[PDB]
Amino acid sequence: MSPSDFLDKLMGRTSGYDARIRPNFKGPPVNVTCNIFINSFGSIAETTMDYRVNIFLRQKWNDPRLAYSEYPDDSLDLDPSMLDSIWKPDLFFANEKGANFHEVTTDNKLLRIFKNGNVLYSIRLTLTLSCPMDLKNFPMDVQTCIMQLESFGYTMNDLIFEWQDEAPVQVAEGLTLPQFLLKEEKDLRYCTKHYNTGKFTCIEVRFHLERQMGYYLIQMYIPSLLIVILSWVSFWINMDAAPARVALGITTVLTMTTQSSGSRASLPKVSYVKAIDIWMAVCLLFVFSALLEYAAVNFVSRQHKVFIDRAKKIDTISRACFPLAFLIFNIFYWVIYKILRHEDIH
Amino acid sequence: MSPSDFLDKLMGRTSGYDARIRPNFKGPPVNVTCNIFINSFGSIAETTMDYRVNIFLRQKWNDPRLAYSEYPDDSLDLDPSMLDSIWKPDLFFANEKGANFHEVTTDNKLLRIFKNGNVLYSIRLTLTLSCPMDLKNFPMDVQTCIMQLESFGYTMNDLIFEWQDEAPVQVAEGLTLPQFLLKEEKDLRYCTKHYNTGKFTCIEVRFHLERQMGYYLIQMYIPSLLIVILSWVSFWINMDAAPARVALGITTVLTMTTQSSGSRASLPKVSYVKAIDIWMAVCLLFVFSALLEYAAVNFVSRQHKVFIDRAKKIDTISRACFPLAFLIFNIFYWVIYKILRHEDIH
Amino acid sequence: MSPSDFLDKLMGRTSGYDARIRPNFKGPPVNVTCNIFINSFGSIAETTMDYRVNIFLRQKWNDPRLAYSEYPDDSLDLDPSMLDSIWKPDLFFANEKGANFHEVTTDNKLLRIFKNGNVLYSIRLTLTLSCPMDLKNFPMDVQTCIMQLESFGYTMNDLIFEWQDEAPVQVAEGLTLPQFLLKEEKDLRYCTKHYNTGKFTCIEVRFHLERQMGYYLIQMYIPSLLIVILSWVSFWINMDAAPARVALGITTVLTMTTQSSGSRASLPKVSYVKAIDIWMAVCLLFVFSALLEYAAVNFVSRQHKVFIDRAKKIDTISRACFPLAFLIFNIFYWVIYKILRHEDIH
Amino acid sequence: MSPSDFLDKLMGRTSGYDARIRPNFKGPPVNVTCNIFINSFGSIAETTMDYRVNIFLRQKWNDPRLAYSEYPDDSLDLDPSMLDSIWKPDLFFANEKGANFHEVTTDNKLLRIFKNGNVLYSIRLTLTLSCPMDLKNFPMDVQTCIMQLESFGYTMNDLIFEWQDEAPVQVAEGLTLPQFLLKEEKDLRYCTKHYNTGKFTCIEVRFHLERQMGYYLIQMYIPSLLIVILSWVSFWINMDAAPARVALGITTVLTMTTQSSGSRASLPKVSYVKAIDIWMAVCLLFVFSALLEYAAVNFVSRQHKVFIDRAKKIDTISRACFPLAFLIFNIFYWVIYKILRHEDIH
Amino acid sequence: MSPSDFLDKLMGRTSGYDARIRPNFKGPPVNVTCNIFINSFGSIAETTMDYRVNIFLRQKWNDPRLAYSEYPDDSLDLDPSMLDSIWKPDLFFANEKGANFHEVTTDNKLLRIFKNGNVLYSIRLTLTLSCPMDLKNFPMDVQTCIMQLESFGYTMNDLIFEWQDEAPVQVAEGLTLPQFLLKEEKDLRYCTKHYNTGKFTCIEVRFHLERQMGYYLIQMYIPSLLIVILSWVSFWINMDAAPARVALGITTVLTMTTQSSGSRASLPKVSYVKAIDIWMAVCLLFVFSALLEYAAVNFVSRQHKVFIDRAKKIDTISRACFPLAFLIFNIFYWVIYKILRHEDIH
Ligand SMILES: *[C@@H]1O[C@H](CO)[C@@H](O[C@@H]2O[C@H](CO)[C@@H](O)[C@H](O)[C@H]2NC(C)=O)[C@H](O)[C@H]1NC(C)=O
Ligand SMILES: *[C@@H]1O[C@H](CO)[C@@H](O[C@@H]2O[C@H](CO)[C@@H](O)[C@H](O)[C@H]2NC(C)=O)[C@H](O)[C@H]1NC(C)=O
Ligand SMILES: *[C@@H]1O[C@H](CO)[C@@H](O[C@@H]2O[C@H](CO)[C@@H](O)[C@H](O)[C@H]2NC(C)=O)[C@H](O)[C@H]1NC(C)=O
Ligand SMILES: *[C@@H]1O[C@H](CO)[C@@H](O[C@@H]2O[C@H](CO)[C@@H](O)[C@H](O)[C@H]2NC(C)=O)[C@H](O)[C@H]1NC(C)=O
Ligand SMILES: *[C@@H]1O[C@H](CO)[C@@H](O[C@@H]2O[C@H](CO)[C@@H](O)[C@H](O)[C@H]2NC(C)=O)[C@H](O)[C@H]1NC(C)=O
């Protein structure tokens, strides 16, 4: 009746329970059903290609040696300090770079035991998980982060992991990300590792994150468009003001180069072309073409009177031709980069 | 009479005390009253959306098995090394990203036991707590940091947390923050977590922090206003000095772009518009309009004499119209951003 | 006679010594005298408002139960591994953000026991201590760092800390700081904490640090003075060279703005005005006034001959008036900021 | 038959097994065969000259005292908590700056014991390994990272390490690096340490990494080439526009200096010349020569008419001579830096 | 004969060996001879004034109680897990800011015991050691790093440290440093600490590091020399081109200021003058003098014809006088900073 003697009667030397033996030795494999609650989600860094998460991991399995029939209550929520005295699955995260438990006050490790021997085991973890990021279409990209739960020491004939049938991944209410939107749907997949040591169980969960475009509109696109429009001002300046137009061209080209360099400041040094790179390259080509247009005008207007009329015609043609070509480029760029974004994330 | 035998007579194998059993087993839930002393408060980072605090956490509860009637003194302040031999609540901080205890010399873990079994337990902690920050109205914003104290392994029928009736949150005297002002009032709320594992107790405390505006006046607003005034100098320069006025416009526009980029250097990449963004955008529009005004003057004054008088009229009109419009914008901006700040923090 | 049996005869089950009981139970409080040797001193960061120190902490007290009369030698320097078997004071550092012990080879924890029971206990620590910094007069400021030694679990009726009468704070010979000068005198004060848990002993030591001005002369003051002198060159250029003088004014103003922004790069975002801020503001006002002077000259000289003579008079007056006013400002600035520095540090 | 008594019958006080004695005491040395699975590979930093890896390390050896003949199954995959009760080799990584084990849930330490006493021991590690990098030919370099497995406490007469005959190094499928390509072939070598303490076994594995050139084309080469082409525009401007051409030369030279400084931002301060340094130096020489060409033209054209024709001839010659010389330099540079890259990596 | 009983017969309760007593109690002090193997050497940071090293530390002493006469072999290389059961010296590093042991696989702690009781104890450590750096002559300086090995708990009458007579400091073959050259000779000195707690043994080793000058030639000296040569181009431009020459002077002065600021980017904020500071100051003075020369020419040439001839004479004199004075300064600077470097390092 007392609780103290029941605790060590269930598991102990008198009971003969061995925590080094899985519940069904030399029998069917242990079936562990897992679910995850995401308390926080952030620190998504493209430079290191990883993200930090904080979760409650819940594992449920069955231990026949832990079945009791004395206490009337079906479930026993006991003290989370006898985890060392019972068998537990050897779960680990395959793509984890860094993981830690939480020891604030009492370690966060809930354990409930049912009448039939069902064990529920909940533990709070902080993980840093690697995420290979495809940075093509970078300002308008969608990334897929994965989380793999794998057995390290037991093969498929001893330990099998399964996702819970209902709500395997829950997210804390009000969880928002400053840079990304987390899609409501989450993919559950069956990884299965094959090493030279054998076959090991694995379960995978995939989160989809869409980058928000407002910051890049404020920071990169609008300043570059302003530089292009500023370079167009040269066409309305008197053709005899050589220092003015030449300085306009120089400053616009150099500023465009600086902005192109700065657009990849917080990104890994990937060796393919991104969407922002295409935008910056076209803007640089536009400002360079404006400077070359003035160079042609200056060269033509001193060939001595059709040489003056020809330069005036070049300026008047450019005044309308540059914005029209830029508008056509903008239409094509935005249409094709909002059409690629209609490709299925899967 | 001796202290040594009393210490292990109160809790030990002879006494039969079990630290794995809560004080009132199969009875009413344990009522733990908590209070907090804030020793330090700082490291408020908008990029990571967290703040670091150092606290003394005091928990008081009642243990009937710990009631004694031998020693005359009502309270016993004993050695803080037998915390492992008594039951303690499993408190944890829900929004904590990182927590640590202090082990300098002797671990800081005071324990007092009263005659009636009242236990007072004080522990020094350093916490990093996540704070979701609303950066709209950024230079003139007010943030609300929260701290949640929650039970991990016990449900509401076993463990209930309550704030102390008098002085639940105390702050160290002379505690100041370089960037923020901490409001005297603190909000105490009742969170209550509902997971698939059950219902768990929670208590919340909210601190209000008002950002001080002096640094942003020195660093961002005044330099931008100086750039705008500098761009106004062009209107008083001779209209024939094309390189001078064109260079003025170019340099002011490029400097304005650089300042706008630098105004978000230490901020998260949020995708909404802040107050400083509106200010920078309007200043950029003003300097761009000054350059376009000179472009119009230069184009008009060479159409050949009303063409010269018209350009002179444009310059004389701009000389008065630009500062007046800027003053009207300043009045509206500051009035509406000191009117929004009158909205109740709650 | 053997040492091995004497070691556990002094403290052990046979002796009846209890390490959980203070030396004079139910009697006068234990008087612990402390002294500190500073091995290193550095990492003074204004952004985080803390400094890192490395110390040897020596505590001396009396334990009557540890008095022996067998060995002829008065002092016994024993192995530093039986610290767990004797009572020790629960000292801690109130303003410490981070502390660590040193475990290189054998842990650094000397223990000597005298014939009369006097215990000397020396331990090597590394501390990060918070220092609230008053950054007014920043380039020519004097800071006061404090170190508080406080009892966590014992009140004044059980434990009292005192500084040693002679040499309570010693500094390692040749200890220098790259940015600061450490004053020879150190202040010893009596803090005493009053919480809702009671009254706790505290002792405080204050170090005074004077910032050295050579780096700021090389880095900030001289470049700004050079920019001001460069802006004065405009007064000697021909008044018809509008692009030259206008470009001089623009570049000087923009460079002054950049230097003013950079002068607060490694400082916390405080919301008051510092001395370097006043210097930068006055230099910016000077260069802006030079540009406005040229704007006035350019406007006046085209009003058509007294209009040319008047502009020449303005230039000739400015040539002498600008350096004289700057010299007067320099005299006042340096005099009042070397007069404020004569205020007593206490 | 029971597992519990078999576990401590194999190794324990009853068996007489001593974990402090190697399997063949006073006999032939223990032959440990090792293999490695690389789970992740990244964080290759030139500044610190190290790279971070995550591996599964598998060691196989023979322990005659662990041979059993009771259980029918040839292999026993037991609980990974009795590693302390058996002898294990003292492997360590010679070039490791930082190493850590993984304790997520159950520590990742698989152990299998065969009928004949063969022990297979697999452990998950995260290593930071130093890599001395030869940065000559930096944008087009190939680096060789090494990993050394060495015995610390046993000499060659007690412990010998060998690579597994088949698949000693496996890489996870889909493992990619943002900056480098990892060559399929891996070199296996026999290091052998000779200290004053004796001779110690060592085995080495070498990975070859080729840097991808796309990022440096986008970031460094193309902007510099654009600056050079921009400097060529001066030759087509009217020779009387002195401020325009002089400003072109100044801006191109200063931008070239800034790009040369920025090309070594994320590199160690090595004291030899790299390929990117040669490219930047030649580009700087080209833009400086363009400015000096205009200086010569300006000086010649005012010697007063053959002085005007001579300056025109200089400009017309430069118009064709500068791009031709730059093209010849580009041909030579790229040919010799894609010829050096044909040198055998070994 | 068996090894297992011999291991605990040598040290154990049966033997009576006490690890808390030094080998010769109440006798002559223990003489520990030390030597060091440097596996790696790097991370020399001037900002924090420290360097990181990785070493094997070998200590040899004599323990009479450990002398055996049973096993025929003179030396026993036993398992490195019984270090807790024998006495060891309490060595520590006086100038260490951070130290860590290596626990990869089996902890790296070799122990050999000889027939006569000689103990050899080797341990792998990673240290961060503070190094006070004299940054006068910074680009061409030589630094001296020290390493102190000191006893913490034992005085000179109990424990004495000595360097090994032959090869006390060995360096791994092929050890190179990107920024420094490590001199072959190493100084061995006798520190001896005198505290208020007594006299403590210490041994010191000094390494000499010479900074390599190639990086600073590429990064700082050559760009500044190019800026000076660029400023000399103004003397060959027509004296009537005021915007061109004035812009040349402005850009050269501002770029020189920026380079002077950037030359101390990765250095502590010391308050004395370095060699690079002298170089930058003289270059800044040269470019400022060129601008002032043009200002004088512009002022003189409009005093209205001897006023034109005088300005032409000033320009022609400057054309030869500026490079000659710069060459003389270069000769003096390099001669005296390669003469100071001939001072003996000791
Ligand atoms: C774990 O789940 C697996 C899969 O459902 C179970 O394996 C099945 O067991 C039933 C009952 O004995 C057999 O009829 C099936 O043929 C098995 N299928 C496979 C693929 O093995 C297994 O028994 C479960 N383990 C436990 C302990 O209940
Ligand atoms: C903890 O506090 C709760 C709330 O005051 C107590 O619950 C009440 O107990 C009284 C006395 O038995 C009952 O009359 C009330 O109906 C209870 N209310 C509720 C909502 O449960 C509880 O008894 C306290 N626990 C202890 C150990 O004193
Ligand atoms: C610790 O120091 C205090 C202060 O000197 C001692 O308290 C005094 O003790 C003497 C001797 O009994 C009394 O006459 C005084 O009245 C006490 N003064 C106060 C303010 O308490 C105390 O006894 C010392 N403790 C020990 C163990 O020696
Ligand atoms: C480990 O491998 C070595 C090398 O194969 C073995 O050494 C050989 O052992 C055989 C059998 O006794 C001898 O005939 C050879 O002369 C040995 N060669 C050398 C170079 O020593 C060694 O026996 C193996 N160890 C074990 C325990 O099997
Ligand atoms: C450690 O070394 C010291 C110095 O050599 C030894 O001290 C000497 O011991 C000899 C032999 O007894 C004496 O003759 C000398 O007078 C001692 N000199 C000094 C300065 O003390 C010491 O004996 C050595 N310790 C051991 C255990 O051998």
For residue C310, what is the enclosing H or E element? helix C306-339
Q: Are D205 and D161 in contact (CB under 8 A)?
A: no
Tally of residues, chain E:
346
Q: How many degrees, rounded to 5, is the angle at CA C85 between CA C84 and CA C87?
A: 85
* Distance between C126 CA and the closest CA of chain E, angstroms: 8
Residue B98 counted as an annotated binding residue: no
Q: Which residue's alpha carbon is nearest to atom 18 within ligand 4?
A: D28
Considering only the beta carbons, identify the residue of C111, C178, C247 that sits closest to E250: C247
Q: What is the CA radius of gyration of chain E?
A: 32
Q: Do A42 and B25 touch (CB under 8 A)?
A: no
d(CA E52, CA E41): 6
Q: What is the CA radius of gyration of chain C?
A: 32
As a 3-state breakdown, chain E gives helix, strand, coil percent values, each rounded to 5, of: 35, 30, 35
State whether the Cα torsion C223-C228-C234-C235 is positive or negative. negative
D325: CB partners within 8 A, 6+ apart: none
DSSP string covering B207-275: EEEEE-SHHHIIIIIHHHHHHHHHHHGGGGS-TT-HHHHHHHHHHHHHHHHHHHHHTTTTS---SS--H
Residue B56 counted as an annotated binding residue: no
Return the residues preceding each gap in chain E, C–N over 2.5 A, or none: 304
Interface test with B, best of C54, C246, C301, C303 (most B CBs within 10 A): C246
E neighbours by CB contacts (3+ pairs under 8 Å): C, D
Backbone phi and psi for residue B120, each to the nearest 5 degrees, phi listed first? -115, 125
Instruction: State the DSSP code for C152.
Output: S
Instruction: State the DSSP code for A154.
Output: -
What CATH number did the domain enclosing D268 receive?
1.20.58.390
Q: Which residue of E has its CA nearest to D22?
A: E79
Question: Does residue E64 sit at the C interface (CB-CB below 8 Å)?
Answer: no
**Distance from the alpha carbon of residue A187 to the mean position of ligand 2, in angstroms:** 45
d(CA E321, CA E323): 6
Q: Do A49 and D42 touch (CB under 8 A)?
A: yes
d(CA D306, CA D304): 9
Locus of tokens 């205020």: C343
Distances in whole angstroms, Cα of residue E288 to Cα of each of C231, C324, E246, E250: 12, 21, 11, 9
d(CA E62, CA E66): 8
Pair (C33, C113) in one structural domain: yes
Treating both helix axes as pointing N-terminal to C-terminal, what angle do A242-262 and D242-262 enclose, rounded to 10 degrees?
10
Instruction: State the DSSP code for E29.
Output: P
Distances in whole angstroms, Cα of residue C345 to Cα of each of C184, C315, C342, E321: 13, 47, 8, 53
Q: Are A162 and A177 in contact (CB under 8 A)?
A: no
d(CA B132, CA B48): 9
Boundary-marking domain end, from E161, E178, E211: E211
Pair (C194, C59) in one structural domain: yes
Report CA E107 to chain centroid distance, whole Å. 29
Q: Do C298 and B237 touch (CB under 8 A)?
A: yes
Q: Which two tokens stand for residue C287?
A: 């260069």
C44-63 burial, b at 16+ Cβ within 10 Å, e below that, comes to: bebeebbbbbbbbbbbbbbb
Residue D183 counted as an annotated binding residue: no
Q: Is A155 in the pocket of ligand 1 (CB under 6 A)?
A: no
Q: Which two tokens stand for residue B72?
A: 């005359």
d(CA D296, CA D311): 8
Q: Using CB atoms within 10 A of its CB, is residue A218 exposed (0-12), middle (13-18) or buried (19+)?
A: buried
3-state secondary structure of B95: coil
Question: Beta strands C75-78 and D75-78: pairing type?
Answer: unpaired
Contacts of A18 in chain D (CB under 8 A): 3-4, 7
Q: How many degrees, rounded to 5, is the angle at CA E219 between CA E216 and CA E222?
A: 90
Locus of tokens 């008095």: C67
Contacts of B223 in chain C (CB under 8 A): 257, 260-261
Residue B199 counted as an annotated binding residue: yes
Report CA B337 to chain centroid distance, whole Å. 20
Helical segments of chain E, H only:
3-10, 214-216, 222-232, 242-262, 275-300, 306-339
* Distance between A34 CA and the closest CA of chain D, angstroms: 13
Question: Does residue C244 sit at the E interface (CB-CB below 8 Å)?
Answer: yes
In chain A, beta strands by DSSP E? 30-45, 50-62, 75-78, 91-93, 96-101, 109-114, 118-130, 142-151, 159-163, 169-171, 180-182, 187-189, 192-195, 198-211
3-state secondary structure of A84: helix
Pair (D325, D272) in one structural domain: yes
Boundary-marking domain end, from A211, A242, A269: A211
d(CA D293, CA D298): 9
Q: Which two tokens stand for residue E91?
A: 């060595």
Q: Residues of E numbered 304-343 whose beta carbons fall under 8 angstroms of chain C's beta carbons: which are they?
A: none
Q: Which two tokens stand for residue D30?
A: 């223990």
Q: Is D118 in the pocket of ligand 4 (CB under 6 A)?
A: no
As beta bridge partners, residue D118 has: D62
Pair (E91, E126) in one structural domain: yes
Pair (D94, D195) in one structural domain: yes
Pair (A88, A198) in one structural domain: yes
Report CA B44 to chain centroid distance, whole Å. 6
Q: Do B49 and A42 touch (CB under 8 A)?
A: yes
Boundary-marking domain end, from C165, C192, C211: C211
Q: Are C139 and C220 in contact (CB under 8 A)?
A: yes
Q: What is the CA radius of gyration of chain D?
A: 32
Question: Does residue C195 sit at the B interface (CB-CB below 8 Å)?
Answer: yes
User: Letter for the amino acid at D315?
Assistant: D
Considering only the beta carbons, identify the residue of B77, B102, B215 that sits closest to C269: B215
Backbone phi and psi for residue C66, each to the nearest 5 degrees, phi listed first? -95, 5
Backbone phi and psi for residue C313, each to the nearest 5 degrees, phi listed first? -65, -40
d(CA C46, CA C270): 11
What CATH number did the domain enclosing B36 receive?
2.70.170.10
Q: Which two tokens stand for residue C219?
A: 């880095």
Task: Give the residue among E93, E153, E156, E101 at the shortest CA–CA distance from E125.
Answer: E101
**Distance from the alpha carbon of residue B25 to the mean position of ligand 2, in angstroms:** 14
Q: Are C220 and C259 in contact (CB under 8 A)?
A: yes
d(CA E137, CA E341): 9
d(CA C89, CA C119): 11
Domain with E91 in it: 3-211
Task: Give the residue among C149, C41, C164, C64 at the shortest CA–CA distance from C113.
Answer: C64
Distances in whole angstroms, Cα of residue D198 to Cα of each of D154, E76, E296: 9, 13, 78
Q: Which two tokens stand for residue E54?
A: 């990785």
How many domains does one find in chain D?
Answer: 2
Give resolution, Å, one decimal: 2.2
d(CA C2, CA A151): 56
Backbone phi and psi for residue A147, each to the nearest 5 degrees, phi listed first? -140, 120
Task: Give the residue among A148, C186, A267, C261 at the shortest CA–CA distance from B255.
Answer: C261
Q: Which two tokens stand for residue E5?
A: 């009983």
Backbone phi and psi for residue D249, each to the nearest 5 degrees, phi listed first? -60, -45
Contacts of E215 in chain D (CB under 8 A): 269-271
Q: Are D50 and D128 in contact (CB under 8 A)?
A: yes
Q: Is E23 in the pocket of ligand 5 (CB under 6 A)?
A: no
Q: Are C276 and C216 in contact (CB under 8 A)?
A: yes
Helices and strands: H and E segment counts in chain A: 6, 14
Pair (A176, A260) in one structural domain: no
For residue C110, what is the enclosing H or E element? strand C109-114
Task: Give the residue among B189, B201, B209, B102 at the shortest CA–CA distance from B150.
Answer: B201
Instruction: State the DSSP code for B29.
Output: P
Pair (C85, C201) in one structural domain: yes
Q: How many degrees, rounded to 5, is the angle at CA A21 between CA A19 and CA A26?
A: 160
Q: How many degrees, rounded to 5, is the angle at CA E227 between CA E224 and CA E233?
A: 150
C174: left (phi over 0), alpha (psi -120 to 50) or beta: left
Pair (D24, D53) in one structural domain: yes
Residue D187 counted as an annotated binding residue: yes
Q: Do D20 and E77 touch (CB under 8 A)?
A: no
State whether the Cα torsion E277-E282-E285-E291 is positive or negative. negative
d(CA B277, CA B141): 14
3-state secondary structure of B160: strand
Residue D304 counted as an annotated binding residue: no
d(CA C337, CA C278): 11
Question: Beta strands C169-171 and C30-45: pairing type?
Answer: parallel
Task: Give the residue among C45, C174, C136 at the shortest CA–CA distance from C97.
Answer: C45
As a 3-state breakdown, chain D gives helix, strand, coil percent values, each rounded to 5, of: 35, 30, 35
Pair (D16, D96) in one structural domain: yes
Pair (B191, B87) in one structural domain: yes
In chain D, beta strands by DSSP E? 30-45, 50-62, 75-78, 91-93, 96-101, 109-114, 118-130, 142-151, 159-163, 169-171, 180-182, 187-189, 192-195, 198-211
* Distance between A197 CA and the closest CA of chain B, angstroms: 37
d(CA A63, CA A65): 6
Tally of residues, chain D:
346
Q: Are C185 and C169 in contact (CB under 8 A)?
A: no
Q: Is D29 in the pocket of ligand 4 (CB under 6 A)?
A: yes
Task: Give the residue among D55, D104, B152 at the shortest CA–CA distance from A89.
Answer: D104
d(CA D245, CA D234): 6
Task: Give the residue among B184, B167, B56 at the shortest CA–CA distance from C94.
Answer: B56
User: Letter for the amino acid at D101?
Assistant: F
Pair (A311, A237) in one structural domain: yes
Q: Do B89 and A105 touch (CB under 8 A)?
A: yes
Task: Give the residue among A121, A102, A76 at the shortest CA–CA distance from B20.
Answer: A76
Q: Which residue of B has its CA nearest to C243?
A: B244
Considering only the beta carbons, identify the residue of E4, E176, E233 that sits closest to D291: E233
Q: Which atom of ligand 3 lies nearest, measured to the CA of C31?
A: 1
d(CA C50, CA B213): 24
User: Letter for the amino acid at A294?
Assistant: Y
